[PDB]
Enzyme design. Sequence first.
Site, mmCIF file in Angstrom:
data_model
loop_
_atom_site.group_PDB
_atom_site.id
_atom_site.type_symbol
_atom_site.label_atom_id
_atom_site.label_comp_id
_atom_site.label_asym_id
_atom_site.label_seq_id
_atom_site.Cartn_x
_atom_site.Cartn_y
_atom_site.Cartn_z
ATOM 1 C CG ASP A 25 51.929 28.640 35.798
ATOM 2 O OD1 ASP A 25 52.052 27.413 35.999
ATOM 3 O OD2 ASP A 25 51.275 29.097 34.846
ATOM 4 C CB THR A 26 55.201 24.685 39.086
ATOM 5 O OG1 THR A 26 53.901 24.084 39.140
ATOM 6 C CG2 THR A 26 55.542 25.299 40.457
ATOM 7 N N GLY A 27 53.924 25.275 35.968
ATOM 8 C CA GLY A 27 53.663 24.719 34.641
ATOM 9 C C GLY A 27 54.227 25.557 33.502
HETATM 10 C C1 JZP Z 1 52.085 23.971 28.504
HETATM 11 C C2 JZP Z 1 51.383 23.987 29.859
HETATM 12 C C3 JZP Z 1 51.906 22.846 30.699
HETATM 13 S S1 JZP Z 1 49.661 23.779 29.628
HETATM 14 C C4 JZP Z 1 49.126 24.734 30.995
HETATM 15 N N1 JZP Z 1 50.278 25.528 31.444
HETATM 16 C C5 JZP Z 1 50.295 26.399 32.463
HETATM 17 O O1 JZP Z 1 51.272 27.076 32.750
HETATM 18 C C6 JZP Z 1 49.042 26.527 33.292
HETATM 19 O O2 JZP Z 1 49.389 26.775 34.657
HETATM 20 C C7 JZP Z 1 48.114 27.621 32.759
HETATM 21 C C8 JZP Z 1 48.459 29.026 33.265
HETATM 22 C C9 JZP Z 1 47.328 29.980 32.963
HETATM 23 C C10 JZP Z 1 46.555 30.479 34.011
HETATM 24 C C11 JZP Z 1 45.503 31.354 33.747
HETATM 25 C C12 JZP Z 1 45.224 31.730 32.432
HETATM 26 C C13 JZP Z 1 45.999 31.234 31.384
HETATM 27 C C14 JZP Z 1 47.051 30.356 31.647
HETATM 28 N N2 JZP Z 1 46.740 27.251 33.065
HETATM 29 C C15 JZP Z 1 45.951 26.667 32.155
HETATM 30 O O3 JZP Z 1 46.336 26.323 31.050
HETATM 31 C C16 JZP Z 1 44.505 26.432 32.521
HETATM 32 O O4 JZP Z 1 44.272 26.483 33.930
HETATM 33 C C17 JZP Z 1 42.966 26.550 34.344
HETATM 34 C C18 JZP Z 1 42.128 25.334 34.440
HETATM 35 CL CL1 JZP Z 1 42.831 23.733 34.043
HETATM 36 C C19 JZP Z 1 40.804 25.458 34.856
HETATM 37 C C20 JZP Z 1 40.250 26.703 35.169
HETATM 38 C C21 JZP Z 1 41.000 27.881 35.088
HETATM 39 C C22 JZP Z 1 42.334 27.846 34.683
HETATM 40 CL CL2 JZP Z 1 43.300 29.345 34.576
HETATM 41 C C23 JZP Z 1 51.494 25.297 30.640
HETATM 42 C C24 JZP Z 1 51.805 26.470 29.745
HETATM 43 O O5 JZP Z 1 50.895 27.066 29.188
HETATM 44 N N3 JZP Z 1 53.095 26.798 29.620
HETATM 45 C C25 JZP Z 1 53.567 27.771 28.651
HETATM 46 C C26 JZP Z 1 53.746 29.100 29.259
HETATM 47 C C27 JZP Z 1 52.831 29.834 30.004
HETATM 48 C C28 JZP Z 1 53.242 31.086 30.475
HETATM 49 C C29 JZP Z 1 54.525 31.592 30.210
HETATM 50 C C30 JZP Z 1 55.467 30.874 29.462
HETATM 51 C C31 JZP Z 1 55.081 29.631 28.982
HETATM 52 C C32 JZP Z 1 55.887 28.664 28.161
HETATM 53 C C33 JZP Z 1 54.970 27.430 28.120
HETATM 54 O O6 JZP Z 1 55.556 26.405 28.926
#
Ligand code: JZP
EC number: 3.4.23.16
Lengths: 99, 99
Positions: A25-27
């Site tokens: 996960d690059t996000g």
């Molecule tokens: C802030 C963001 C840019 S918003 C989305 N995001 C991320 O990292 C995203 O890739 C996130 C990851 C995820 C996958 C599955 C279940 C839940 C969450 N995905 C999502 O938020 C939503 O993704 C989906 C969509 Cl758009 C449609 C259908 C199904 C899905 Cl899973 C970032 C984030 O949350 N990052 C936070 C994070 C996540 C995990 C660990 C550490 C941290 C810090 C913080 O940076």
Amino acid sequence: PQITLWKRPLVTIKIGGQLKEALLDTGADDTVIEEMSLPGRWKPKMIGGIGGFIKVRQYDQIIIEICGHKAIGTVLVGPTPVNIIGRNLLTQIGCTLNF
Amino acid sequence: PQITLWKRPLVTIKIGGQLKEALLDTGADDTVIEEMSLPGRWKPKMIGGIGGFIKVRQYDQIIIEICGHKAIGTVLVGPTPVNIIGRNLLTQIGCTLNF
Ligand SMILES: CC1(C)SCN(C(=O)[C@@H](O)[C@H](Cc2ccccc2)NC(=O)COc2c(Cl)cccc2Cl)[C@@H]1C(=O)N[C@H]1c2ccccc2C[C@H]1O
Ligand SMILES: [Cl-]
Ligand SMILES: [Cl-]
Ligand SMILES: [Cl-]
Ligand SMILES: [Cl-]
């Protein structure tokens, strides 16, 4: 390896002696894993994303195996719906985005 | 380009003739953008992230430029903390993960 993005970039990881599936996960700034035991000390942390924030436990200097590549770093443990490998460990295995 | 992950993979996008910052996010299935005006009809969508679920507006076949690369696909609009380019458009611009 080259991983296409047609489907979720899921990989097998080894953490704390346990095999788990995790999303590359690059996000994500950090790595977060579903509830599990890890050794050593931890401190509380809040991480935010879509939907809002969750409370996690932060463990530092944790070794993980990702696709055979060993990496060390901070790992967060908490109520994440998906095991996520974040940038802090993705850098360590030499992972880039290419197009 | 090759994008390393030592910092957030933030890029410039163009949507509706407007430049915006967005995050290349391999953990997101879909593309989510903060509140803005888009042409045409929308339909309901719930997406699940780290802190839970949010309601978004789904707009199909939207013209969008990402780091100079032209894409046409689904853009979700809602209360996302940051603009994110998910796998639906990353595949369109030929993006892969490599290590
Ligand atoms: C802030 C963001 C840019 S918003 C989305 N995001 C991320 O990292 C995203 O890739 C996130 C990851 C995820 C996958 C599955 C279940 C839940 C969450 N995905 C999502 O938020 C939503 O993704 C989906 C969509 Cl758009 C449609 C259908 C199904 C899905 Cl899973 C970032 C984030 O949350 N990052 C936070 C994070 C996540 C995990 C660990 C550490 C941290 C810090 C913080 O940076
Ligand atoms: Cl939110
Ligand atoms: Cl780290
Ligand atoms: Cl590097
Ligand atoms: Cl699409």
